[PDB]
């Protein structure tokens, strides 16, 4: 399997699935390095974030646990097709990149906070991460290039 991917067992259904311990992605389907990647992200900050403030709210008071619940909800809506990643990033990302539908542009290794870099480089083009924790908060990352 590709970097980070492992086989796992559904607790509710008993069917095999695949989990990536670098990106926190999970999926039923068997999974399908670059010098630079282009990613978008959706950030949900919390009270332990290095800077608990964003364009959305001056004092961010939600707990890490609450942030993770919000991230999980956004992932659910994205995966069901109820909402687009770009639309959720524009509305709800605690990063100024929200104004560009979450797009960060292209970057190489040795530029981003480490969990974010590692997730970004382990995604294939078009793939989305699970919840990725950094000192910034919790991210959903979409690799676009």
């Amino acid at each position: 399997l590709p970097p980070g991917w492992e086989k796992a067992m559904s607790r509710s259904s008993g069917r095999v699935y695949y989990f990536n311990h670098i990106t926190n992605a999970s999926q039923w389907e068997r999974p399908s390095e670059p010098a630079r990647v282009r990613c978008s992200h959706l950030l949900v900050k919390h009270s332990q974030s290095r800077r608990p403030s964003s364009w959305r709210q001056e004092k961010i008071t939600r707990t890490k646990e609450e942030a993770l619940e919000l991230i999980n909800g956004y992932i659910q809506k994205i995966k069901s097709g109820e909402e687009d990643f770009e639309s959720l990033a524009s509305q709800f990302s605690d990063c100024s990149s929200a104004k560009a539908r979450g797009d960060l542009g292209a970057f190489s290794r040795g530029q981003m906070q480490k969990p974010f870099e590692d997730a970004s480089f382990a995604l294939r083009t078009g793939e989305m991460s699970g919840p990725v924790f950094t000192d910034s908060g919790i991210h959903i990352i979409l690799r676009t290039e």
Binding site: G110, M112, Q113, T134, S136, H139
Partner: peptide, 5 residues
């Protein structure tokens, strides 16, 4: 600046 090292 945001998730930049």
């Amino acid at each position: 600046f945001x998730x930049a090292q």
